[model samples]
Target: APDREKALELAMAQIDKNFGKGSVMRLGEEVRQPISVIPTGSISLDVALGIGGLPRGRVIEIYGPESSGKTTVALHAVANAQAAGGIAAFIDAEHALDPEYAKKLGVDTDSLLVSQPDTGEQALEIADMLVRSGALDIIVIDSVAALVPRAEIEGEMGDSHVGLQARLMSQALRKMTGALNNSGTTAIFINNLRETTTGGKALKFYASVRLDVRRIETLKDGTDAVGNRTRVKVVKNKVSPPFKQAEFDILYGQGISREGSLIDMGVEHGFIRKSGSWFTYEGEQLGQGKENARKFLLENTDVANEIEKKIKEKLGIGAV
Candidate 1:
């Protein structure tokens, strides 16, 4: 009788408090500190978001639809981090990364340690290791949408059960964030977009520095094949603010600054400060992707020739 009475009292009180029927907890003091943001090095975007960049020690999510520039941006960030004398780690939740494509994108894949996580739990565990190991400068989870499942976990689960799971996951993420940020490392999470049935509106979930990418097609003179360009926009930011986002022509093989900003190719594709859709086709139109690649080989043949000359010199032959 005594045990039953105690248990009943405890259960009733807990249920009452949960239902706003009672209160035994009081508000705690608020802790305030200077907000830290990640620097994307984009002038317009940073300014617009009122963020200098992404917050220093927080999670930043970049969400967009398929064929979006998430991978490109992630690669750029990796390149930027390395240029800043740092290292980066990528956990590919979608298993969609192409190592060969990275090489062509001017990214040194050797410097990258990429992982493919099959589940949210696995991904979070890997992230925890990355944060605690202190070997990475930039830690990226390339796609939350892919890593976390869409179907809710179930076993006749109650709301509390789901909350507990979410809390645990979020706690791990927060811990990783704190660890990385404290160590001066930045973390980025990429997410994909999905179209909802509501008025055909597209919604992206769980991202900080959000962006939407769309392809642009130029009508050719006669044939359908024309030059190509991509439109990338920074639609969300929690950093100080995004920089004045301008259009930088996206020319393959042209290369980019360490900050992932477009490098100076020539007069043809100088950095243009334009709002909205800007021409990413900044380089001179040479030919198709394959043709342009051939051009690269032809133009840089001197490199190979130099190697051959060195080999001949070693053999005591003519320096042909």
Candidate 2:
């Protein structure tokens, strides 16, 4: 036994010498456990992600067509981070992030760092620096598609600028991955869905989680469009089960309707039973219509909270 112990010690010492001190560790001890997460402000989405929210210290990509609530979802996460007393920043590569809309969505504009970089390289560098600083809890790059390469901007209008953004993106993601994995910040990259090849492929390869958002339908109150039903699909996830999906409403001027989503989830999961036009929960009648039921749930905060908890429980989302 003593000889075996001596041999094991010698092996460990040799490995440490070659790899650096403390580099070698027991397999179980070296394995990284799950970190904390930030909710995306939609209860159904929180459940759909299977981790309760976006995993911190990792790269998350959200891509979809125009006006599909991609930015709104990221902003919702930013608001959540700030609500938890964490710093958040937005690299508005699109240069189109409306401050008034962000404020209406509960984002604390005073403390949030909003930057509009002129070049794609600058945006990437800013993101890398922020991640390495370890001072932020979340940082969002408004888009991968909108990142204009300096060469493209400087070149003539008809000049061929093929694969420039993709090359830069690949390098940036490679360089930032390690820094992001070591930090506590949740880096979210918003992208647009395009037919042609772009930096999206690199983002898909490097991102730990990739969400695809699509607009199901435009919701209208009378003749005016009020909001849209957006569907979010988890196409890739390293922290939990992938391919899960959830649909929620993105109200205009406001953000995701928590009450509405909770009610819908409750009904779908049988927590809230619906017969004809009446809705019932826990042997009590909510109301005669869906809106009435929603109104009841809104008025009764305790009931709404209870239903939310039950829905999460049913979805196998444990309390964090």
Candidate 3:
């Protein structure tokens, strides 16, 4: 024991001399391991991503057409950050930030730093500064599409900057990448989906993960538009496996709704036997309707816990 302790001391002194001060290392020290992550706020999406959530210390790009809930999804992450005792910054280049809606979605308005930058270069500059600050847990830029190039904003309409904005995005990401790696900050960029595009490819190439959201089904109350089910696709990922897709339901008034068609989900997944509208679990007919399925599970603690565990296993709901 004495010899091993002396040997460790000698190694430490040698490491400091050969490398630099604080060069001596121990287990779980001085090494860049897999980054921890925050949840995307939806179990379905979280499970699909297979990281339990979006990893920190990386750039994430979320893109989709209007009314596709791109910003909503971004805010979910923001809400998550604040709930986890972390601060967030939102750069609203489009000047369309709705405080009430964001607050309703669980974002701490007072804690969130909201900035409005007219040009893409300005937005990138601000973003770079925030990432470098290393104080905020997550910084979101909403979004890439609304940001005009500095030249485009100042010059005449006939003039074309071609891919100036794209180049700036590339530079910003390249610079921020190191800062994020050093500080473990999460940078989320909300981008508008354009019918035609080229520069966006550069953003995609530099991003650690990119999610594409599209609406596939609508949920309504008679004639009114109540909600819609959206599909999320992971197109690019350097931190985890790509091509993971999942469906989540969004309510207009409630934001992200709790599980959709819970009984159906349980029955389809073969977790519960079904007869007509009734759900049967462990030889007991739980009852009818989605609420019944939830109530029955809640009333039976052991069954509920096991069912959730099984579901999560099938869905891979915990962080990797």
Candidate 4:
């Protein structure tokens, strides 16, 4: 026990252990690992996502404040995935879903199965059920904010538990995403943002894409707000730069000019208007950049900037 040979053996073993060769001695070829990819519904975002599309074995999170267009993008992706010959699943934790709204997103009501979980636990349970069923090509979770914190604390003291709850929720979601990965299903987790410090400073948020949405105040002449002017800002994009941005013209996808979401406003105010007006921006639009900025406003429907101006935009909601 007092021998230097034993001491030498102990020291050598620790040295090898600490160096992390793990007693395997010299190693040779490194195993190749596959890259996970998710197919973005649009080519533009796909390129932004780093890969050509969504990474198959990972979670593509879209986090934002309310009305940021999370639902718009998420639904678009889901619809696209469904069209690609796969079923889609949505788990709504907030219970704020309107079936008609989802249908407007082009999701087949009959084909789409939705759940409203009164509690976060119930919602997570539903996610577990759906992922395990193996029928989903896309599994979108409405939110992680619904996770309730521990009951041990009270008042402002309860705030301390929020992070703990968020972590737990994230852990559960990771497990679910991993399971869905095996089934070749892409997972999209929609997150909500908040301003901490009693609404003083912007708080930290989580997600692959941390987008922030804000309503653009309309002008008397019916123009979209200017100067990016406190509109939505995508603060973080995990796959790319932190400030990667995407424009969501309140105009409908494909520019069809259907009945607007403001008909209710007219009806409520007893205006008896035929349809809602769109907000026109003096900037470039898709397919037609700066050249058509104002002209596109003339030819296209009015809701483009109007919707952007009026709607409390935040968070990219899941669509398909």
TM-scores of the candidates are 0.54, 0.84, 0.77, 0.54
lDDT comparing candidate 4 with the true structure: 0.50
User: Model 2 segments beyond 4 Å from truth?
Assistant: 1-34, 156-161, 194-197, 220-224, 316-320
- Report the Cα lDDT for candidate 1: 0.49
CA RMSD of all predictions: 17.2, 6.9, 8.7, 14.6
Reference-based TM-score, model 1 = 0.54
In candidate 4, what are the lDDT values of residues 114-145, reduced to their tens digit?
Answer: 87766555676777778877777887777656
How well is each residue in 5-42 modelled by candidate 2, as lDDT tens digits? 68988997898689544345442232133458889988
State which candidate has the highest lDDT.
Answer: 2
Cand. 2 Cα-lDDT: 0.82
lDDT by candidate, in order shown? 0.49, 0.82, 0.73, 0.50
Which runs of model 3 end up more than 4 angstroms from their true locations?
A: 1-34, 157-161, 195-198, 221-224, 261-268, 273-310, 313-320
After superposition, the stretches of candidate 4 with alpha carbons farther than 4 Å from their true spots are 1-43, 149-164, 195-243, 252-320
lDDT (Cα, 0-100) at 208 in candidate 3: 76
- For each candidate, how many residue pairs have backbone atoms clashing (under 3 Å)? 35, 0, 0, 32
Candidate 3 TM-score, true structure as reference? 0.77
Q: For candidate 3, what is the lDDT? A: 0.73
**What TM-score does candidate 4 get on C-alpha atoms?**
0.54
Candidate that beats the other on lDDT, 1 or 3, i.e. the better one? 3
Residue 4 lDDT in candidate 2: 81
TM-score of 2: 0.84
